[PDB]
Design a binder for these strands. Structure first.
Ligand SMILES: [Mg+2]
Ligand SMILES: [Mg+2]
Ligand SMILES: [Mg+2]
Ligand SMILES: [Mg+2]
Ligand SMILES: [Mg+2]
Ligand SMILES: [Mg+2]
Ligand SMILES: [Mg+2]
Ligand SMILES: [Mg+2]
Ligand SMILES: [Mg+2]
Ligand SMILES: [Mg+2]
Ligand SMILES: [Mg+2]
Ligand SMILES: [Mg+2]
Ligand SMILES: [Mg+2]
Ligand SMILES: [Mg+2]
Ligand SMILES: [Mg+2]
Ligand SMILES: [Mg+2]
Ligand SMILES: [Mg+2]
Ligand SMILES: [Mg+2]
Ligand SMILES: [Mg+2]
Ligand SMILES: [Mg+2]
Ligand SMILES: [Mg+2]
Ligand SMILES: [Mg+2]
Ligand SMILES: [Mg+2]
Ligand SMILES: [Mg+2]
Ligand SMILES: [Mg+2]
Ligand SMILES: [Mg+2]
Ligand SMILES: [Mg+2]
Ligand SMILES: [Mg+2]
Ligand SMILES: [Mg+2]
Ligand SMILES: [Mg+2]
Ligand SMILES: [Mg+2]
Ligand SMILES: [Mg+2]
Lengths: 205, 80, 122, 156, 82, 129
RNA sequence: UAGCUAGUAGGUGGGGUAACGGCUCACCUAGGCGACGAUCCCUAGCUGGUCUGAGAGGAUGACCAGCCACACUGGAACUGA
RNA sequence: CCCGCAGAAGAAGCACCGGCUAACUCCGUGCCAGCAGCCGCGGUAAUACGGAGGGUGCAAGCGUUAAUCGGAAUUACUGGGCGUAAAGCGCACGCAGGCGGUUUGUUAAGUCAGAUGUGAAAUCCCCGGGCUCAACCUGGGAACUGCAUCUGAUACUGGCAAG
């Protein structure tokens, strides 16, 4: 139910940095980020329309760590919801609890955040939530519980997050180790490299 | 006001009884054309008042025979 | 075409026959090998293709391909047949299932094992 | 700003005393994203040359299209010999729901929200020709007002 | 005769009873004349959980409808709460 | 036999526009006159003129704007072989509301928009674009 | 599969049913159904729904709920609201 | 459901990589062995067979088979056609049937409008609520395009009467 393989392998295949490493060390130093994985990496075949759409979808899925059935469900939900479908999909993905934890900074990677969430380190509105796919809502406080409050990983992660670019849609208290999910982000608020439109076309073939 | 149907008398041979076509001008389910559909009814008529070709108004009633559950109420356009 | 014509005589749906009628809308069916032989392919191919004429549980006498390299089949050998034609044996509409009742899994296969009934090697 | 994209590249042959002579044909389509779209069909012995010829042709002989807010003006049909095409305006956010060639032509033209289908033949060149014809013919409400001798407000 | 009784609905271990008027012969979840309320025994706090249309119940009783013991209890609870 | 006079009239209009004819003449009828009147009101033709007593002739004066025909398309819808009637919620919008649809209602022959405003359906005679 | 039907179609009168009724019986009349498909043959429980489809349709009727029929096969009644 | 204990500990496979269709190399065989949904591949340099390495796609599942709708405007009511691609009876007459120039009156059958009754609950959809989330359960709506009756309108079509 989770991808347990090499992460820079995934990043190399996509082309971009998927943030599968903490970002202490540069990805160029950890791998040949430019060259694609495998014997035939040093080759860029001309990509079909289907291929480009698939690659974009794969990129997004890898970024968040969602397998296909769940991703498809997300897309359907987005389509059902009013407004722009790609935008809705992005919002839902962002809404995921592991993602919010990562954004707040209670984990260097989403993999780390997911681990914490699974292992019951994270309380949503003072109630231990265990599901990584848990949709966080606006005005939801999300906090590290004290047993995980002593974790050196958590404090290190916070430091790394401080280095990273802070999200506008959250407000996080580093000493309290609690963050309030004020609102679901807008498309202008999320990253521009993601071409949600390709994904919409692919799941609307 | 009572429920009643009009129709042309298709036959009047069986005694005290007439057969009354009740053509309805329905629309076709699929093609949308309007088709003339027909409804034969055995109607009871006492006194054998009705002729063939006669327009006749009928109402529904308790069954009077195997096939006969309608009675006539008034004849109209009873020309020959 | 004329609306009147359609009303008179409506449009007939094109009743498509099945191409695997011995299955009788079953996903597989059991049968007994009446006869096991090799046959020549069609004009763009040369081979000796392994095939068995099989009497099915429901009466039908069909012909069935035997895929994979080598097989432990002979007369009176109970097998499961599945849908699929050999495009190049004329009139063969069914495959044997490798890895079923009397049919053995293919020997020494490491790929497509699920398709050839071979258990995972250590 | 003159967005262009090649729909289909196809190899065609001629026969001569010697043997066969192959050559390539490229169907391209350019457009400014504000209404103007034009297709071009180039032929050359090699693909890049063919594409260049096609591009030049497309860049010239463009045609203006009445677009209403990045969408069609009304549902329009279009034919070109085998290719009969249907295309319908759709709500903002629908995206281009359109075949191959059709999708390309619409996108370069600048329609952002359409529902299309290609009936009949789906031969790229003919289908593109059909779509361009349909788009061209499609009139706007200002046009209808002008024709009928009314205000646009009387027609709506 | 006509009776007013609970019909079990919901999921396993999470019952939700629909209060229905029905001919006693009919099966528990089967044919019923009128649905006159609901009752949710696992309903949490800050949730209604019970709702009986009392006027309809009164009307049916007047007509001569018997009442299940549980439904009677529910009616009593509603009256006290209100 | 002549089996559809309205259709004939529509065809005449179409052919006149195709052939750049200034006017088109045909045997007059009350329904035809009503349709023509609707057309004039909406501005798809310049004028109509009924002339004669025993067997009167309708003469429509067709309309051109930039060398080309104003009535781009004009199709019969209801026809003797297949009558079409619509309810107020089902009334069609021709060319997404730019063209008009001539509808015969209980309150006389009117365009689709007018009929919708009134709140009644009827026999859909033709679309005009 | 083009003709089918003699309680067959209708009437009068008795009987019968909780009830109308050829439900049944006696007589009288000679009708009745059928190309808008009678009769005959093959297949099938029906519906809310389900799947699919832009829709119109197409396919389908497990589960859940409404109706129907059956209870080894073929008949029959008794008791009883 | 909660608390505690120990220790990464007990927990990843299946299909595919010639085009359609995301993913390529080497070796083995040599029209054989075999593959295949279609088109096709293999006759001694096989990205198509078989193994390996590498990769792609799904993932506690993954393939294959069967079955239905879709694509299929390939039964075309919406929405096709018939000179030569399949398709105009060899030609006529004519009953049933389908269609009917033009005016007025009348009727109100088709048609249209409004109301009333019904269209079980579940289901579908919308806004909520409850299971840590989801599935699932659930409150209220919307919908159920239908059918029936009554009251109207009378342009068109039908009936009737005169032209
Ligand atoms: Mg799962
Ligand atoms: Mg056949
Ligand atoms: Mg060959
Ligand atoms: Mg009697
Ligand atoms: Mg008596
Ligand atoms: Mg049966
Ligand atoms: Mg049955
Ligand atoms: Mg369709
Ligand atoms: Mg069963
Ligand atoms: Mg029984
Ligand atoms: Mg029994
Ligand atoms: Mg038994
Ligand atoms: Mg018995
Ligand atoms: Mg008793
Ligand atoms: Mg008794
Ligand atoms: Mg590829
Ligand atoms: Mg293979
Ligand atoms: Mg060799
Ligand atoms: Mg080799
Ligand atoms: Mg291959
Ligand atoms: Mg291989
Ligand atoms: Mg179809
Ligand atoms: Mg055709
Ligand atoms: Mg021919
Ligand atoms: Mg001839
Ligand atoms: Mg007339
Ligand atoms: Mg007539
Ligand atoms: Mg009426
Ligand atoms: Mg319901
Ligand atoms: Mg909730
Ligand atoms: Mg009239
Ligand atoms: Mg009249």
């Amino acid at each position: 139910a989770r991808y347990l393989g090499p992460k820079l392998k995934l990043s190399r295949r996509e082309g971009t940095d998927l943030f599968l490493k903490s970002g202490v060390r540069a990805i160029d130093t950890k791998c040949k980020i430019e060259q694609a994985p495998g014997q035939h990496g040093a080759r860029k075949p001309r990509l079909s329309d289907y291929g480009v759409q698939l690659r974009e979808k794969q990129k997004v899925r890898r970024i968040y760590g969602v397998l296909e059935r769940q991703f498809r469900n997300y897309y359907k939900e987005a389509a059902r919801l009013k407004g722009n479908t790609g935008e809705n999909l992005l919002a839902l993905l962002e809404g995921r609890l592991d993602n919010v934890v990562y954004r707040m900074g209670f984990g260097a990677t989403r993999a780390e955040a997911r681990q914490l969430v699974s292992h019951k380190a994270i309380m949503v509105n003072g109630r231990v939530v265990n599901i990584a796919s848990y949709q966080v809502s606006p005005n939801d406080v999300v906090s590290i519980r004290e047993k995980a409050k002593k974790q050196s990983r958590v404090k290190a992660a916070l430091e790394l997050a401080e280095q990273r670019e802070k999200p506008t849609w959250l407000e996080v208290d580093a000493g309290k180790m609690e963050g309030t999910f004020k609102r679901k982000p807008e498309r202008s608020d999320l990253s521009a490299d993601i071409n949600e439109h390709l994904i919409v076309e692919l799941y609307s073939k | 006001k009572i429920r009643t149907l009009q129709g042309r008398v298709v036959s009047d041979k069986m005694e005290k009884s007439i057969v009354v076509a009740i053509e309805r001008f329905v629309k076709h389910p699929i093609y949308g054309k309007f088709i003339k559909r027909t409804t034969k009814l055995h109607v009871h008529d006492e006194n054998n008042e009705c002729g063939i070709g006669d327009v006749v108004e009928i109402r529904e009633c308790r069954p009077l025979s195997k096939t006969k559950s309608w009675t006539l109420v008034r004849v109209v356009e009873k020309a020959v | 075409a004329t609306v009147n014509q359609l009303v008179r005589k409506p449009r007939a749906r094109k009743v498509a026959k099945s191409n695997v009628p011995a299955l009788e809308a079953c996903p597989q069916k059991r049968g007994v090998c009446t006869r096991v032989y090799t046959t020549t392919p069609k004009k763009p191919n040369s081979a000796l293709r392994k095939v068995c004429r099989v009497r099915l549980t429901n009466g039908f006498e069909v012909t069935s391909y035997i895929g994979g390299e080598g097989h432990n089949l002979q007369e009176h050998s109970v097998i499961l047949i599945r849908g699929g034609r050999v495009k190049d044996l004329p009139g063969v509409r069914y495959h044997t299932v490798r890895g079923a009742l009397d049919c053995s899994g293919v020997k020494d296969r490491k790929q497509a094992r699920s398709k050839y009934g071979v258990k995972r090697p250590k | 700003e003159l967005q262009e994209k090649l729909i289909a590249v196809n190899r065609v042959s001629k026969t001569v005393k010697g043997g066969r002579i192959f050559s390539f044909t490229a169907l391209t389509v350019v457009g400014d994203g504000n209404g103007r779209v034009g297709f071009g069909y180039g032929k050359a012995r090699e693909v890049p040359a063919a594409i260049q010829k096609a591009m030049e042709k497309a860049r010239r002989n463009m045609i203006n299209v009445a677009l209403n807010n990045g969408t069609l003006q009304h549902p329009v049909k279009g034919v070109h010999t085998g290719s009969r095409v249907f295309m319908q305006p759709a709500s903002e956010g629908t995206g281009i729901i359109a075949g191959g060639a059709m999708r390309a032509v619409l996108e370069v033209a600048g329609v952002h929200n359409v529902l299309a289908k290609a009936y009949g033949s789906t031969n790229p060149i003919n289908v593109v020709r059909a779509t361009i014809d349909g788009l061209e013919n499609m009139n706007s409400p200002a046009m209808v007002a002008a024709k009928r001798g009314k205000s646009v407000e009387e027609i709506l | 005769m006509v009776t007013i009784r609970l019909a079990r609905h919901g999921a396993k271990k999470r019952p939700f009873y629909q209060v229905v008027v029905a001919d006693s012969r009919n099966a528990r979840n089967g044919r019923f004349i009128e649905r006159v309320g609901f009752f949710n025994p696992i309903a949490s706090e800050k949730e209604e959980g019970t709702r009986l249309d009392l006027d309809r119940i009164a009307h049916w009783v007047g007509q001569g409808a018997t009442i299940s013991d549980r439904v009677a209890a529910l009616i009593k609870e509603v009256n006290k709460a209100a | 036999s002549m089996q559809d006079p309205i259709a004939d009239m529509l065809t005449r209009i179409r052919n006149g526009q195709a052939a750049n004819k200034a006017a088109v003449t045909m045997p007059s009828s009350k329904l035809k006159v009503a349709i023509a009147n609707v057309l004039k009101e909406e501005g798809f033709i310049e004028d109509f003129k009924v002339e004669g007593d025993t067997k009167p002739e309708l003469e429509l004066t067709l309309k051109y704007f930039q060398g080309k025909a104003v009535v781009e398309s004009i199709q019969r819808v209801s026809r003797p072989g297949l009558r079409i009637y619509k309810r107020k919620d089902e009334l069609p919008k021709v060319m997404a509301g730019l063209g008009i649809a001539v509808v015969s209602t209980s309150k006389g022959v009117m365009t689709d928009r007018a009929a919708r405003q009134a709140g009644l359906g009827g026999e859909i005679i033709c679309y005009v674009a």
